[PDB]
Amino acid sequence: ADKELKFLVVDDFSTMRRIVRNLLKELGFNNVEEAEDGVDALNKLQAGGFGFIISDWNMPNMDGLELLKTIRADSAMSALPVLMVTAEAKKENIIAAAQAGASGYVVKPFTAATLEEKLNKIFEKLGM
Ligand SMILES: [Mg+2]
């Protein structure tokens, strides 16, 4: 994984975005942009050059599942890695995301070490 991979962090909580950005920083990933909800994220993804999306499951207007399905359906972004974030792991949520193409799932709060492990797992799973 290129340390310069461009990340999109999506969460309706500013503070949760700041945590994720700070965690990534710690790992050496400084290339991060932020979005507030699914539609905000799609707007930004339009400009191109993103490499990895970290999205919250629970967001207004367009939730994580919807954003993920829209990414998967788009010819230009369909392969982008998507890491889903939830405050509470639920079997049907996990199955629904997997089936929709999520690259992985992480329960918050999480440390830099957990994030790293999730990141490496996906890079490994996707041969990146
Ligand atoms: Mg949220």
- The domain containing residue 77 runs over which residues? 1-128
Neighbours of ion ligand 1 (CB under 5 A): 12, 56, 58-59
Residue 58 marked in a binding site: yes
DSSP sequence for 96-128: HHHHTT-SEEEESS--HHHHHHHHHHHHHHHT-
**Token pair in block for residue 95:** 């199955």
Strand 82-86 and strand 104-107: pairing?
parallel
The CA–CA distances, whole Å, from 27 to 18, 43, 69, 100, 103 equal 15, 27, 28, 28, 19
d(CA 29, CA 3): 5
**What is the number of other CB atoms lying within 10 angstroms of the CB of residue 76?**
10
What is the CATH number for 109? 3.40.50.2300
Contact of 9 with 21, CB cutoff 8 Å: yes
Q: Is 60 exposed, middle or buried (0-12, 13-18, 19+ CB in 10 A)?
A: exposed
Domain tally, the chain: 1
Residue 51 φ then ψ, to 5°: -115, -15
Method used experimentally = X-ray
Residue 27 CA to residue 65 CA, distance in Å, equals 27
